[PDB]
Amino acid sequence: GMDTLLILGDSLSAGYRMSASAAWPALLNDKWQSKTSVVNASISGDTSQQGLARLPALLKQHQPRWVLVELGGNDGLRGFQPQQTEQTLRQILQDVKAANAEPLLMQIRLPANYGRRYNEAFSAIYPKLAKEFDVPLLPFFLEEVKKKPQWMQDDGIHPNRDAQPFIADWMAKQLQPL
Numbered sequence: 001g002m003d004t005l006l007i008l009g010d011s012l013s014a015g016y017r018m019s020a021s022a023a024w025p026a027l028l029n030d031k032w033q034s035k036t037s038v039v040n041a042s043i044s045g046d047t048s049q050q051g052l053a054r055l056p057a058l059l060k061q062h063q064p065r066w067v068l069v070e071l072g073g074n075d076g077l078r079g080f081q082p083q084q085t086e087q088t089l090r091q092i093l094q095d096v097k098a099a100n101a102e103p104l105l106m107q108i109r110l111p112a113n114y115g116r117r118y119n120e121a122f123s124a125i126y127p128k129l130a131k132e133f134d135v136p137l138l139p140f141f142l143e144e145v146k147k148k149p150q151w152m153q154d155d156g157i158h159p160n161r162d163a164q165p166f167i168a169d170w171m172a173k174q175l176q177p178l
């Protein structure tokens with residue numbers, strides 16, 4: 001049958017200041033045609049806690065086979081304690097499993113700030129949780145996209161619309177084994 005992949009994300013999945021149909025998860029939905037449905041449930045600015053709050057209703061509504069979790073970056077951009085982001089993501093993963101869905105956890109990393117300690121503590125939560133839950137750990141695309149000015153909005157922070165087909169094709173390759 002035609003299964004649903006739910007994306008629980010922030011602007012990296014929603015697409016910042018663009019139509020939903022322009023964002024890579026919609027392009028991926030188009031690529032996959034009727035073989036697999038992609039539901040983008042991503043909102044710019046969401047923290048992991050905000051994604052957690054939205055998740056139960058989405059699980060009930062969409063009954064997805066897999067949930068790609070792409071969250072925590074805002075927590076880290078705001079200097080939130082990594083243990084709290086870890087715990088929130090842990091709860092997300094528990095909820096997804098208890099809904100009989102398979103979680104897929106995207107690694108997130110932060111831009112430079114001061115020293116390496118905070119950023120390393122933040123990035124470490126993702127392989128830890130993927131091992132703990134024994135779930136797929138998907139690679140993070142944002143640093144590579146940021147190397148292409150032609151793929152970035154004027155802020156140098158958010159990918160633009162032209163980035164999205166490239167991200168879609170890359171994510172398709174990463175998700176094909178599903």
Ligand SMILES: CCCCCCCC(=O)O
Binds near residue numbers: 073142
């Ligand atoms: C650098 C960590 C990844 C940031 C993604 C979240 C951006 C946003 O939703 O506005």
